[PDB]
Structure 1
Protein backbone atom coordinates (compact mmCIF):
# COMPACT_ATOMS: atom_id res chain seq x y z
CA UNK A 1 0.00 0.00 0.00
CA UNK A 2 0.93 3.67 -0.14
CA UNK A 3 0.52 4.00 3.63
CA UNK A 4 3.35 1.54 4.22
CA UNK A 5 5.77 4.23 2.98
CA UNK A 6 5.13 6.16 6.20
CA UNK A 7 6.66 3.32 8.24
CA UNK A 8 10.11 2.87 6.65
CA UNK A 9 11.75 4.57 9.62
CA UNK A 10 11.25 5.18 13.31
CA UNK A 11 8.09 7.21 13.92
CA UNK A 12 7.20 9.16 17.10
CA UNK A 13 4.11 7.96 18.96
CA UNK A 14 1.70 9.77 21.27
CA UNK A 15 -0.93 7.86 23.26
CA UNK A 16 -3.74 9.56 25.16
CA UNK A 17 -6.27 7.54 27.13
CA UNK A 18 -9.17 8.87 29.16
CA UNK A 19 -10.81 6.23 31.31
CA UNK A 20 -13.80 5.71 33.53
CA UNK A 21 -13.83 2.43 35.44
CA UNK A 22 -16.75 1.96 37.84
CA UNK A 23 -16.91 5.76 37.80
CA UNK A 24 -13.22 6.17 38.66
CA UNK A 25 -11.93 8.80 36.21
CA UNK A 26 -8.31 8.61 35.12
CA UNK A 27 -5.99 9.63 32.30
CA UNK A 28 -2.85 8.17 30.82
CA UNK A 29 -0.34 9.83 28.51
CA UNK A 30 2.33 7.91 26.68
CA UNK A 31 5.13 8.89 24.35
CA UNK A 32 7.76 6.97 22.52
CA UNK A 33 8.46 5.63 19.08
CA UNK A 34 7.86 2.64 16.82
CA UNK A 35 9.69 0.95 13.99
CA UNK A 36 7.71 -1.35 11.75
CA UNK A 37 10.94 -2.54 10.12
CA UNK A 38 11.59 -4.72 13.19
CA UNK A 39 8.16 -4.39 14.81
CA UNK A 40 9.64 -2.64 17.83
CA UNK A 41 7.77 -0.19 20.03
CA UNK A 42 9.20 1.67 23.00
CA UNK A 43 7.00 3.90 25.15
CA UNK A 44 6.69 5.36 28.59
CA UNK A 45 3.20 5.89 30.04
CA UNK A 46 2.27 8.01 33.01
CA UNK A 47 -1.01 8.25 34.87
CA UNK A 48 -1.63 11.98 34.89
CA UNK A 49 -4.45 11.84 37.46
CA UNK A 50 -2.54 10.12 40.29
CA UNK A 51 -2.45 6.39 40.92
CA UNK A 52 -3.77 4.28 38.09
CA UNK A 53 -6.98 2.72 39.49
CA UNK A 54 -6.61 -0.49 37.46
CA UNK A 55 -3.46 -2.60 36.91
CA UNK A 56 -1.06 -1.36 34.24
CA UNK A 57 -0.93 -4.77 32.48
CA UNK A 58 -4.68 -4.62 31.83
CA UNK A 59 -4.18 -1.50 29.66
CA UNK A 60 -1.32 -2.73 27.47
CA UNK A 61 -3.48 -3.99 24.61
CA UNK A 62 -5.51 -0.75 24.62
CA UNK A 63 -2.52 1.58 24.77
CA UNK A 64 -0.80 0.68 17.51
CA UNK A 65 -0.81 -2.34 15.24
CA UNK A 66 0.37 -0.28 12.28
CA UNK A 67 3.86 -0.89 13.75
CA UNK A 68 3.66 -4.66 13.32
CA UNK A 69 6.41 -6.09 11.10
CA UNK A 70 4.79 -7.67 8.09
CA UNK A 71 7.25 -9.91 6.20
CA UNK A 72 7.72 -8.98 2.52
CA UNK A 73 5.51 -11.81 1.28
CA UNK A 74 2.68 -10.62 3.56
CA UNK A 75 2.67 -6.89 2.85
CA UNK A 76 -0.52 -7.17 0.78
CA UNK A 77 -2.27 -8.22 4.02
CA UNK A 78 -1.34 -5.20 6.17
CA UNK A 79 -4.65 -3.43 6.74
CA UNK A 80 -3.28 -1.19 9.45
CA UNK A 81 -0.67 0.61 7.35
CA UNK A 82 -2.96 0.70 4.31
CA UNK A 83 -5.43 2.86 6.26
CA UNK A 84 -2.72 5.49 6.97
CA UNK A 85 -2.30 8.40 7.22
CA UNK A 86 -6.03 9.01 7.66
CA UNK A 87 -6.09 6.12 10.11
CA UNK A 88 -8.56 3.74 11.62
CA UNK A 89 -10.96 3.31 14.48
CA UNK A 90 -10.11 0.43 16.83
CA UNK A 91 -12.89 -0.75 19.12
CA UNK A 92 -12.77 -3.49 21.71
CA UNK A 93 -14.69 -5.23 24.42
CA UNK A 94 -12.34 -6.78 26.97
CA UNK A 95 -14.07 -9.19 29.35
CA UNK A 96 -12.28 -10.13 32.54
CA UNK A 97 -13.40 -13.59 33.66
CA UNK A 98 -15.37 -13.46 36.91
CA UNK A 99 -15.10 -9.67 36.93
CA UNK A 100 -16.01 -6.59 34.87
CA UNK A 101 -15.34 -5.52 31.32
CA UNK A 102 -13.78 -2.65 29.42
CA UNK A 103 -15.23 -1.05 26.30
CA UNK A 104 -12.75 0.98 24.31
CA UNK A 105 -12.91 3.23 21.30
CA UNK A 106 -9.72 4.59 19.77
CA UNK A 107 -8.60 6.53 16.77
CA UNK A 108 -5.16 5.76 15.41
CA UNK A 109 -3.91 8.27 12.86
CA UNK A 110 -1.13 10.66 11.96
CA UNK A 111 -1.10 14.13 13.34
CA UNK A 112 1.88 15.60 11.55
CA UNK A 113 4.90 13.32 11.80
CA UNK A 114 3.50 11.57 14.86
CA UNK A 115 1.33 8.56 15.07
CA UNK A 116 -1.37 9.19 17.67
CA UNK A 117 -3.54 6.67 19.49
CA UNK A 118 -6.37 8.46 21.32
CA UNK A 119 -8.65 6.22 23.39
CA UNK A 120 -11.81 6.50 25.44
CA UNK A 121 -12.20 3.59 27.85
CA UNK A 122 -15.20 2.66 30.00
CA UNK A 123 -15.09 -0.11 32.57
CA UNK A 124 -18.13 -1.47 34.39
CA UNK A 125 -19.18 -4.22 36.76
CA UNK A 126 -15.75 -4.53 38.41
CA UNK A 127 -15.72 -6.23 41.77
CA UNK A 128 -14.62 -4.70 44.97
CA UNK A 129 -11.48 -6.51 46.12
CA UNK A 130 -11.20 -8.32 42.77
CA UNK A 131 -8.03 -8.67 40.76
CA UNK A 132 -8.59 -5.46 38.85
CA UNK A 133 -9.76 -2.89 41.42
CA UNK A 134 -7.65 -4.66 44.05
CA UNK A 135 -4.46 -4.53 41.95
CA UNK A 136 -3.71 -8.22 42.36
CA UNK A 137 -2.05 -8.77 39.00
CA UNK A 138 1.66 -9.30 38.54
CA UNK A 139 3.56 -6.56 36.75
CA UNK A 140 4.36 -8.55 33.63
CA UNK A 141 2.76 -9.59 30.35
CA UNK A 142 2.69 -13.00 28.68
CA UNK A 143 3.64 -13.31 25.03
CA UNK A 144 0.63 -14.06 22.86
CA UNK A 145 -0.62 -14.33 19.45
CA UNK A 146 -3.81 -12.85 17.97
CA UNK A 147 -5.52 -13.91 14.76
CA UNK A 148 -6.73 -11.30 12.28
CA UNK A 149 -9.58 -11.82 9.84
CA UNK A 150 -11.13 -9.60 7.19
CA UNK A 151 -14.47 -8.01 7.91
CA UNK A 152 -15.41 -7.18 4.33
CA UNK A 153 -18.88 -5.91 5.30
CA UNK A 154 -17.26 -3.07 7.28
CA UNK A 155 -14.23 -2.72 5.01
CA UNK A 156 -12.04 -3.60 7.97
CA UNK A 157 -10.69 -6.36 10.18
CA UNK A 158 -11.79 -8.16 13.33
CA UNK A 159 -9.90 -10.22 15.90
CA UNK A 160 -10.69 -12.23 19.01
CA UNK A 161 -8.00 -13.30 21.44
CA UNK A 162 -7.41 -14.07 25.10
CA UNK A 163 -4.81 -12.51 27.35
CA UNK A 164 -3.66 -14.46 30.41
CA UNK A 165 -2.83 -12.02 33.23
CA UNK A 166 -0.89 -13.70 36.05
CA UNK A 167 -2.39 -13.11 39.51
CA UNK A 168 -0.18 -12.74 42.58
CA UNK A 169 -1.47 -16.02 44.07
CA UNK A 170 -0.47 -18.01 41.00
CA UNK A 171 -3.93 -18.08 39.46
CA UNK A 172 -4.64 -16.52 36.07
CA UNK A 173 -7.05 -13.74 35.20
CA UNK A 174 -8.28 -14.17 31.62
CA UNK A 175 -9.11 -11.12 29.55
CA UNK A 176 -11.18 -12.03 26.49
CA UNK A 177 -10.79 -9.40 23.73
CA UNK A 178 -13.16 -8.79 20.83
CA UNK A 179 -11.76 -6.22 18.42
CA UNK A 180 -12.98 -4.42 15.32
CA UNK A 181 -11.10 -1.96 13.14
CA UNK A 182 -12.53 0.28 10.40
CA UNK A 183 -10.80 2.89 8.22
CA UNK A 184 -11.41 6.56 8.95
CA UNK A 185 -10.87 7.56 5.30
CA UNK A 186 -12.66 6.42 2.14
CA UNK A 187 -9.53 5.46 0.21
CA UNK A 188 -8.71 1.86 -0.70
CA UNK A 189 -7.45 -0.45 2.06
CA UNK A 190 -5.97 -3.94 2.12
CA UNK A 191 -8.32 -6.60 3.44
CA UNK A 192 -6.19 -9.51 4.57
CA UNK A 193 -6.30 -13.23 4.31
CA UNK A 194 -6.32 -14.90 7.73
CA UNK A 195 -3.05 -14.54 9.64
CA UNK A 196 -1.85 -13.67 13.13
CA UNK A 197 0.27 -11.18 15.00
CA UNK A 198 2.86 -12.45 17.46
CA UNK A 199 3.36 -10.05 20.38
CA UNK A 200 5.84 -9.84 23.25
CA UNK A 201 5.68 -7.13 25.94
CA UNK A 202 8.44 -6.23 28.54
CA UNK A 203 7.17 -4.04 31.36
CA UNK A 204 9.54 -2.09 33.54
CA UNK A 205 9.95 1.01 35.63
CA UNK A 206 11.96 4.19 35.27
CA UNK A 207 13.94 4.51 38.53
CA UNK A 208 13.78 8.31 38.34
CA UNK A 209 10.03 8.58 37.74
CA UNK A 210 7.92 9.41 40.82
CA UNK A 211 4.54 9.24 39.08
CA UNK A 212 2.66 5.99 38.57
CA UNK A 213 3.97 4.80 35.22
CA UNK A 214 4.84 1.95 32.90
CA UNK A 215 7.83 1.59 30.57
CA UNK A 216 6.90 -0.74 27.74
CA UNK A 217 8.91 -2.54 25.09
CA UNK A 218 6.79 -4.37 22.57
CA UNK A 219 7.62 -6.44 19.51
CA UNK A 220 4.81 -7.26 17.10
CA UNK A 221 5.39 -9.54 14.08
CA UNK A 222 2.90 -10.82 11.51
CA UNK A 223 2.96 -14.51 10.62
CA UNK A 224 0.82 -17.36 9.41
CA UNK A 225 1.07 -17.00 5.64
CA UNK A 226 3.78 -19.11 3.97
CA UNK A 227 5.63 -18.23 0.77
Structure 2
Protein backbone atom coordinates (compact mmCIF):
# COMPACT_ATOMS: atom_id res chain seq x y z
CA UNK A 1 0.00 0.00 0.00
CA UNK A 2 0.99 3.60 -0.73
CA UNK A 3 -1.51 4.51 1.98
CA UNK A 4 0.29 2.24 4.44
CA UNK A 5 2.89 4.99 4.94
CA UNK A 6 0.12 7.06 6.53
CA UNK A 7 -0.30 4.54 9.35
CA UNK A 8 3.27 4.19 10.52
CA UNK A 9 2.92 6.37 13.58
CA UNK A 10 0.05 7.18 15.90
CA UNK A 11 -2.84 8.74 13.96
CA UNK A 12 -5.61 10.91 15.47
CA UNK A 13 -9.11 9.48 15.10
CA UNK A 14 -12.37 11.41 15.09
CA UNK A 15 -15.76 9.65 14.85
CA UNK A 16 -19.21 11.14 14.26
CA UNK A 17 -22.47 9.18 14.20
CA UNK A 18 -25.99 10.45 13.43
CA UNK A 19 -28.49 7.75 14.37
CA UNK A 20 -32.23 7.03 14.39
CA UNK A 21 -33.44 3.88 16.17
CA UNK A 22 -37.24 3.46 15.96
CA UNK A 23 -37.71 7.21 15.73
CA UNK A 24 -35.35 7.86 18.65
CA UNK A 25 -32.79 10.19 17.06
CA UNK A 26 -29.33 10.54 18.61
CA UNK A 27 -25.74 11.61 17.96
CA UNK A 28 -22.36 10.27 19.10
CA UNK A 29 -19.00 12.06 18.93
CA UNK A 30 -15.78 10.18 19.66
CA UNK A 31 -12.08 10.93 19.63
CA UNK A 32 -8.84 9.04 20.12
CA UNK A 33 -5.75 7.65 18.48
CA UNK A 34 -4.74 4.53 16.61
CA UNK A 35 -1.45 2.68 16.29
CA UNK A 36 -1.43 0.28 13.34
CA UNK A 37 2.06 -0.91 14.33
CA UNK A 38 0.54 -2.81 17.27
CA UNK A 39 -3.06 -2.74 16.02
CA UNK A 40 -4.05 -0.67 19.05
CA UNK A 41 -7.06 1.67 19.24
CA UNK A 42 -7.88 4.06 22.09
CA UNK A 43 -11.08 6.09 21.85
CA UNK A 44 -13.68 7.93 23.93
CA UNK A 45 -17.29 8.24 22.78
CA UNK A 46 -19.87 10.72 24.06
CA UNK A 47 -23.62 10.78 23.39
CA UNK A 48 -23.96 14.43 22.37
CA UNK A 49 -28.52 13.26 25.78
CA UNK A 50 -28.65 9.61 26.89
CA UNK A 51 -28.01 6.86 24.36
CA UNK A 52 -31.23 5.05 23.33
CA UNK A 53 -29.35 1.76 22.76
CA UNK A 54 -26.56 -0.10 24.60
CA UNK A 55 -23.00 1.00 23.88
CA UNK A 56 -21.81 -2.56 22.97
CA UNK A 57 -24.25 -2.60 20.03
CA UNK A 58 -22.38 0.43 18.64
CA UNK A 59 -18.76 -0.75 19.04
CA UNK A 60 -18.62 -2.47 15.64
CA UNK A 61 -20.14 0.51 13.83
CA UNK A 62 -17.95 3.03 15.65
CA UNK A 63 -11.96 1.88 11.71
CA UNK A 64 -10.29 -1.29 10.38
CA UNK A 65 -7.41 0.60 8.73
CA UNK A 66 -5.62 0.35 12.10
CA UNK A 67 -5.58 -3.46 11.97
CA UNK A 68 -2.05 -4.75 12.42
CA UNK A 69 -1.20 -6.82 9.35
CA UNK A 70 1.92 -8.99 9.74
CA UNK A 71 4.54 -8.46 7.06
CA UNK A 72 3.73 -11.69 5.17
CA UNK A 73 0.16 -10.34 4.73
CA UNK A 74 1.03 -6.71 3.96
CA UNK A 75 -0.31 -7.03 0.42
CA UNK A 76 -3.76 -8.04 1.74
CA UNK A 77 -4.49 -4.73 3.56
CA UNK A 78 -7.33 -3.15 1.59
CA UNK A 79 -8.13 -0.57 4.26
CA UNK A 80 -4.81 1.28 4.29
CA UNK A 81 -4.41 1.06 0.51
CA UNK A 82 -7.66 2.97 0.04
CA UNK A 83 -6.11 5.85 1.99
CA UNK A 84 -5.89 8.82 1.98
CA UNK A 85 -9.01 9.11 -0.20
CA UNK A 86 -10.80 6.62 2.06
CA UNK A 87 -13.51 4.00 1.65
CA UNK A 88 -17.24 3.57 2.21
CA UNK A 89 -18.26 0.84 4.68
CA UNK A 90 -21.94 -0.18 4.57
CA UNK A 91 -23.31 -2.74 7.01
CA UNK A 92 -26.49 -4.62 7.86
CA UNK A 93 -26.64 -5.75 11.49
CA UNK A 94 -29.41 -8.23 12.25
CA UNK A 95 -30.18 -8.83 15.92
CA UNK A 96 -31.80 -12.21 16.44
CA UNK A 97 -35.49 -11.97 17.38
CA UNK A 98 -35.20 -8.17 17.30
CA UNK A 99 -34.61 -5.22 14.98
CA UNK A 100 -31.93 -4.34 12.44
CA UNK A 101 -29.29 -1.63 12.03
CA UNK A 102 -28.40 -0.25 8.60
CA UNK A 103 -25.16 1.76 8.66
CA UNK A 104 -23.14 3.64 6.06
CA UNK A 105 -19.78 5.23 6.84
CA UNK A 106 -17.08 7.28 5.14
CA UNK A 107 -13.61 6.52 6.51
CA UNK A 108 -11.03 8.90 5.08
CA UNK A 109 -8.19 11.30 5.87
CA UNK A 110 -9.22 14.91 6.51
CA UNK A 111 -6.06 16.95 6.95
CA UNK A 112 -4.03 15.01 9.51
CA UNK A 113 -7.00 13.21 11.11
CA UNK A 114 -8.55 9.83 10.28
CA UNK A 115 -12.30 10.53 10.26
CA UNK A 116 -15.15 8.00 10.32
CA UNK A 117 -18.53 9.64 9.64
CA UNK A 118 -21.46 7.28 10.18
CA UNK A 119 -25.16 7.41 9.32
CA UNK A 120 -27.20 4.76 11.13
CA UNK A 121 -30.87 3.74 11.01
CA UNK A 122 -32.34 1.04 13.26
CA UNK A 123 -35.77 -0.41 12.47
CA UNK A 124 -38.23 -3.01 13.78
CA UNK A 125 -37.03 -3.01 17.40
CA UNK A 126 -39.52 -4.02 20.10
CA UNK A 127 -39.57 -1.46 22.90
CA UNK A 128 -39.11 -4.15 25.60
CA UNK A 129 -36.34 -6.03 23.79
CA UNK A 130 -32.72 -6.42 24.81
CA UNK A 131 -31.66 -3.36 22.81
CA UNK A 132 -34.33 -0.74 23.57
CA UNK A 133 -34.90 -2.18 27.05
CA UNK A 134 -31.17 -1.90 27.91
CA UNK A 135 -30.84 -5.53 29.02
CA UNK A 136 -27.20 -5.93 27.90
CA UNK A 137 -24.16 -6.15 30.15
CA UNK A 138 -21.41 -3.56 29.71
CA UNK A 139 -18.32 -5.26 31.23
CA UNK A 140 -19.72 -7.19 34.21
CA UNK A 141 -18.00 -10.08 36.01
CA UNK A 142 -20.76 -11.58 38.20
CA UNK A 143 -23.93 -12.24 36.23
CA UNK A 144 -26.89 -14.59 35.87
CA UNK A 145 -26.38 -18.12 34.46
CA UNK A 146 -29.54 -18.27 32.32
CA UNK A 147 -32.78 -20.03 33.23
CA UNK A 148 -31.79 -22.97 31.01
CA UNK A 149 -28.62 -23.66 32.98
CA UNK A 150 -30.48 -22.88 36.21
CA UNK A 151 -33.19 -25.43 35.39
CA UNK A 152 -30.66 -28.09 34.37
CA UNK A 153 -28.40 -27.72 37.41
CA UNK A 154 -31.25 -27.41 39.92
CA UNK A 155 -33.04 -30.44 38.44
CA UNK A 156 -29.85 -32.51 38.51
CA UNK A 157 -29.20 -31.43 42.09
CA UNK A 158 -32.69 -32.52 43.16
CA UNK A 159 -32.27 -35.88 41.39
CA UNK A 160 -28.87 -36.58 42.93
CA UNK A 161 -30.08 -35.53 46.39
CA UNK A 162 -32.99 -37.88 45.78
CA UNK A 163 -30.62 -40.75 44.99
CA UNK A 164 -28.80 -40.04 48.26
CA UNK A 165 -32.10 -40.11 50.18
CA UNK A 166 -32.57 -43.45 48.43
CA UNK A 167 -29.36 -45.36 49.21
CA UNK A 168 -28.86 -43.78 52.65
CA UNK A 169 -32.42 -44.69 53.73
CA UNK A 170 -43.71 -41.51 42.44
CA UNK A 171 -42.75 -45.19 42.34
CA UNK A 172 -39.01 -45.88 42.04
CA UNK A 173 -38.12 -49.19 43.59
CA UNK A 174 -36.59 -49.87 40.18
CA UNK A 175 -34.05 -47.31 41.25
CA UNK A 176 -32.28 -48.32 44.50
CA UNK A 177 -31.84 -51.59 42.60
CA UNK A 178 -29.43 -49.66 40.41
CA UNK A 179 -27.86 -47.39 43.05
CA UNK A 180 -27.13 -50.31 45.42
CA UNK A 181 -24.90 -52.00 42.83
CA UNK A 182 -21.12 -51.64 42.76
CA UNK A 183 -21.40 -48.92 40.08
CA UNK A 184 -23.45 -46.64 42.33
CA UNK A 185 -20.23 -45.89 44.25
CA UNK A 186 -17.36 -44.03 42.61
CA UNK A 187 -18.73 -45.03 39.18
CA UNK A 188 -17.62 -48.58 40.06
CA UNK A 189 -14.03 -47.77 39.04
CA UNK A 190 -12.68 -45.83 42.04
CA UNK A 191 -12.32 -49.05 44.05
CA UNK A 192 -10.14 -50.53 41.28
CA UNK A 193 -7.60 -47.69 41.08
CA UNK A 194 -7.66 -46.09 44.56
CA UNK A 195 -9.14 -48.98 46.56
CA UNK A 196 -12.40 -48.96 48.47
CA UNK A 197 -10.91 -47.25 51.56
CA UNK A 198 -10.36 -43.97 49.69
CA UNK A 199 -12.30 -40.84 50.58
CA UNK A 200 -12.85 -40.32 46.84
CA UNK A 201 -14.92 -43.56 46.80
CA UNK A 202 -18.19 -41.72 47.44
CA UNK A 203 -21.67 -42.25 46.09
CA UNK A 204 -21.95 -40.87 42.56
CA UNK A 205 -24.63 -38.48 43.80
CA UNK A 206 -21.94 -36.61 45.77
CA UNK A 207 -20.13 -36.03 42.48
CA UNK A 208 -23.58 -35.02 41.22
CA UNK A 209 -24.12 -32.24 43.75
CA UNK A 210 -20.54 -31.02 43.39
CA UNK A 211 -20.88 -31.15 39.60
CA UNK A 212 -24.22 -29.35 39.21
CA UNK A 213 -23.35 -26.78 41.89
CA UNK A 214 -20.03 -26.15 40.13
CA UNK A 215 -21.77 -25.86 36.75
CA UNK A 216 -24.36 -23.40 38.06
CA UNK A 217 -21.66 -21.39 39.85
CA UNK A 218 -19.33 -21.18 36.85
CA UNK A 219 -22.32 -20.25 34.68
CA UNK A 220 -22.42 -16.95 36.60
CA UNK A 221 -18.89 -16.13 35.39
CA UNK A 222 -17.67 -14.28 32.29
CA UNK A 223 -14.02 -15.40 32.27
CA UNK A 224 -12.41 -18.25 30.37
CA UNK A 225 -11.11 -20.46 33.19
CA UNK A 226 -14.74 -21.01 34.19
CA UNK A 227 -15.57 -21.81 30.55
CA UNK A 228 -12.77 -24.36 30.06
CA UNK A 229 -13.40 -25.73 33.56
CA UNK A 230 -17.06 -26.11 32.59
CA UNK A 231 -16.03 -27.90 29.39
CA UNK A 232 -13.70 -30.41 31.05
CA UNK A 233 -16.09 -31.07 33.95
CA UNK A 234 -19.08 -31.59 31.65
CA UNK A 235 -16.90 -33.79 29.42
CA UNK A 236 -15.95 -36.03 32.35
CA UNK A 237 -19.61 -36.01 33.42
CA UNK A 238 -20.60 -37.09 29.91
CA UNK A 239 -18.08 -39.95 29.86
CA UNK A 240 -19.24 -41.18 33.26
CA UNK A 241 -22.89 -40.81 32.19
CA UNK A 242 -22.31 -42.94 29.10
CA UNK A 243 -20.38 -45.52 31.14
CA UNK A 244 -23.16 -45.70 33.75
CA UNK A 245 -25.76 -45.74 30.99
CA UNK A 246 -23.93 -48.71 29.48
CA UNK A 247 -24.12 -50.40 32.89
CA UNK A 248 -27.87 -49.72 33.17
CA UNK A 249 -28.83 -51.50 29.94
CA UNK A 250 -27.19 -54.64 28.53
CA UNK A 251 -25.62 -55.42 31.94
CA UNK A 252 -28.18 -54.80 34.70
CA UNK A 253 -31.09 -54.93 32.22
CA UNK A 254 -32.89 -52.57 34.61
CA UNK A 255 -34.57 -49.31 33.55
CA UNK A 256 -34.54 -46.52 36.10
CA UNK A 257 -36.04 -43.15 35.18
CA UNK A 258 -33.84 -40.75 37.20
CA UNK A 259 -30.82 -42.26 35.43
CA UNK A 260 -32.23 -41.45 31.98
CA UNK A 261 -33.20 -37.96 33.19
CA UNK A 262 -29.69 -37.23 34.48
CA UNK A 263 -28.21 -38.64 31.26
CA UNK A 264 -30.28 -36.11 29.31
CA UNK A 265 -29.25 -33.39 31.79
CA UNK A 266 -25.55 -34.17 31.30
CA UNK A 267 -26.01 -34.18 27.53
CA UNK A 268 -27.65 -30.75 27.80
CA UNK A 269 -24.86 -29.31 29.96
CA UNK A 270 -22.36 -30.86 27.53
CA UNK A 271 -23.87 -29.10 24.50
CA UNK A 272 -24.20 -25.85 26.46
CA UNK A 273 -20.57 -25.96 27.60
CA UNK A 274 -19.39 -26.79 24.06
CA UNK A 275 -21.31 -23.83 22.61
CA UNK A 276 -20.11 -21.49 25.37
CA UNK A 277 -16.51 -22.47 24.67
CA UNK A 278 -16.60 -22.31 20.90
CA UNK A 279 -18.59 -19.14 20.17
CA UNK A 280 -16.31 -16.66 21.94
CA UNK A 281 -15.44 -15.31 18.48
CA UNK A 282 -14.61 -11.84 17.23
CA UNK A 283 -13.36 -13.09 13.85
CA UNK A 284 -14.04 -10.72 10.94
CA UNK A 285 -14.12 -12.92 7.82
CA UNK A 286 -12.96 -10.95 4.79
CA UNK A 287 -13.23 -11.89 1.12
CA UNK A 288 -12.57 -9.82 -2.00
CA UNK A 289 -15.37 -8.30 -4.12
CA UNK A 290 -13.85 -7.57 -7.54
CA UNK A 291 -17.02 -6.19 -9.18
CA UNK A 292 -16.99 -3.20 -6.82
CA UNK A 293 -13.17 -3.13 -6.40
CA UNK A 294 -13.71 -3.60 -2.66
CA UNK A 295 -14.19 -6.22 0.02
CA UNK A 296 -17.10 -8.12 1.56
CA UNK A 297 -17.20 -9.35 5.13
CA UNK A 298 -19.22 -11.63 7.40
CA UNK A 299 -19.21 -12.13 11.15
CA UNK A 300 -21.28 -12.74 14.28
CA UNK A 301 -21.08 -10.72 17.51
CA UNK A 302 -22.63 -12.23 20.64
CA UNK A 303 -23.57 -9.76 23.38
CA UNK A 304 -24.05 -10.85 26.99
CA UNK A 305 -27.60 -10.32 28.27
CA UNK A 306 -28.12 -9.51 31.95
CA UNK A 307 -30.06 -12.77 32.45
CA UNK A 308 -27.05 -14.82 31.29
CA UNK A 309 -28.41 -15.41 27.78
CA UNK A 310 -26.70 -14.19 24.61
CA UNK A 311 -28.08 -11.77 22.03
CA UNK A 312 -26.88 -12.65 18.52
CA UNK A 313 -25.90 -9.90 16.05
CA UNK A 314 -25.14 -10.94 12.47
CA UNK A 315 -22.91 -8.55 10.52
CA UNK A 316 -22.94 -8.15 6.73
CA UNK A 317 -20.29 -5.67 5.56
CA UNK A 318 -19.27 -3.98 2.30
CA UNK A 319 -16.29 -1.71 1.64
CA UNK A 320 -15.78 0.31 -1.56
CA UNK A 321 -12.79 2.58 -2.30
CA UNK A 322 -13.45 6.30 -2.63
CA UNK A 323 -10.72 7.29 -5.09
CA UNK A 324 -10.06 5.96 -8.56
CA UNK A 325 -6.53 5.03 -7.53
CA UNK A 326 -5.22 1.52 -7.13
CA UNK A 327 -6.16 -0.57 -4.08
CA UNK A 328 -5.23 -4.02 -2.83
CA UNK A 329 -7.68 -6.87 -3.33
CA UNK A 330 -6.97 -9.50 -0.65
CA UNK A 331 -7.37 -13.23 -0.52
CA UNK A 332 -9.70 -14.74 2.07
CA UNK A 333 -8.48 -13.96 5.59
CA UNK A 334 -9.79 -12.86 8.97
CA UNK A 335 -9.23 -10.17 11.59
CA UNK A 336 -8.91 -11.00 15.29
CA UNK A 337 -10.30 -8.29 17.58
CA UNK A 338 -10.31 -7.82 21.35
CA UNK A 339 -12.37 -4.97 22.79
CA UNK A 340 -12.20 -3.65 26.36
CA UNK A 341 -14.92 -1.17 27.37
CA UNK A 342 -14.68 0.99 30.50
CA UNK A 343 -15.81 4.32 31.95
CA UNK A 344 -14.10 7.64 32.68
CA UNK A 345 -14.83 8.94 36.21
CA UNK A 346 -14.28 12.52 35.00
CA UNK A 347 -17.19 12.42 32.52
CA UNK A 348 -20.85 12.94 33.42
CA UNK A 349 -22.30 12.64 29.90
CA UNK A 350 -23.43 9.22 28.76
CA UNK A 351 -20.15 7.92 27.37
CA UNK A 352 -18.00 4.87 26.63
CA UNK A 353 -14.22 4.37 26.80
CA UNK A 354 -12.91 1.85 24.27
CA UNK A 355 -9.56 0.05 24.05
CA UNK A 356 -9.13 -2.25 21.06
CA UNK A 357 -6.55 -4.74 19.74
CA UNK A 358 -6.89 -6.02 16.16
CA UNK A 359 -4.44 -8.23 14.26
CA UNK A 360 -4.73 -9.87 10.83
CA UNK A 361 -4.52 -13.66 10.50
CA UNK A 362 -5.49 -16.50 8.19
CA UNK A 363 -3.72 -16.31 4.82
Q: Please classify the TM superposition score into its range, dividing by the shorter chain length.
A: over 0.9
8 Å CA contact 1:12, 1:32 repeated in 2:
yes
Partner of 2:85: 86
5+ long unaligned stretches in structure 2: 140-279
C-alpha offsets along residues 5-50 of structure 1, whole Å, 9 cap, x if unaligned?
0000000000000000001000000000000000000000000x41
8 Å CA contact 1:43, 1:216 repeated in 2:
yes
8 Å CA contact 1:87, 1:110 repeated in 2:
yes
User: Per-residue deviation at 1:86?
Assistant: 0.1
Distance 1:20 1:185 in 2: 29
Of 143-152 and 198-207, the range deviating more from structure 2 = 143-152
Of 125-134 and 143-152, the range deviating more from structure 2 = 143-152
Please point out which of 318, 331, 349 is paired with 1:211.
349
Change (3 A) 1:143 1:215: farther
Distance 2:106 2:11 in 1: 17
Change (3 A) 1:29 1:143: farther
Matched pairs, number: 223
C-alpha offsets along residues 170-221 of structure 1, whole Å, 9 cap, x if unaligned?
0000000000000000000000001000000000000110000000000110
Distance 1:116 1:128 in 2: 32
8 Å CA contact 1:92, 1:103 repeated in 2:
yes
8 Å CA contact 1:15, 1:63 repeated in 2:
yes
Distance 1:35 1:90 in 2: 21
Partner of 1:2: 2
C-alpha offsets along residues 41-75 of structure 1, whole Å, 9 cap, x if unaligned?
0000000x410000000000000000000000100
User: Per-residue deviation at 1:127?
Assistant: 0.5
Higher helix proportion? 2
Distance 1:162 1:2 in 2: 31
C-alpha offsets along residues 143-190 of structure 1, whole Å, 9 cap, x if unaligned?
611110000111000001000000000000000000000000000000
8 Å CA contact 1:143, 1:201 repeated in 2:
no
C-alpha offsets along residues 76-104 of structure 1, whole Å, 9 cap, x if unaligned?
00000000000000000000000000000
Distance 1:95 1:169 in 2: 21
SS of the residue 2:291 aligns to: helix
8 Å CA contact 1:195, 1:223 repeated in 2:
yes
Cα root mean square deviation, aligned: 0.8
Distance 1:220 1:150 in 2: 19
Distance 1:163 1:175 in 2: 5
Distance 1:162 1:144 in 2: 7
Partner of 1:19: 19
SS of the residue 1:59 aligns to: helix
5+ long unaligned stretches in structure 1: none
TM-score (norm. length: structure 2): 0.61
Stretches of 4+ aligned residues off by more than 3 angstroms: none
8 Å CA contact 1:92, 1:179 repeated in 2:
yes
Distance 2:352 2:81 in 1: 30
Higher strand proportion? 1
Distance 1:195 1:93 in 2: 20
Distance 2:96 2:108 in 1: 32
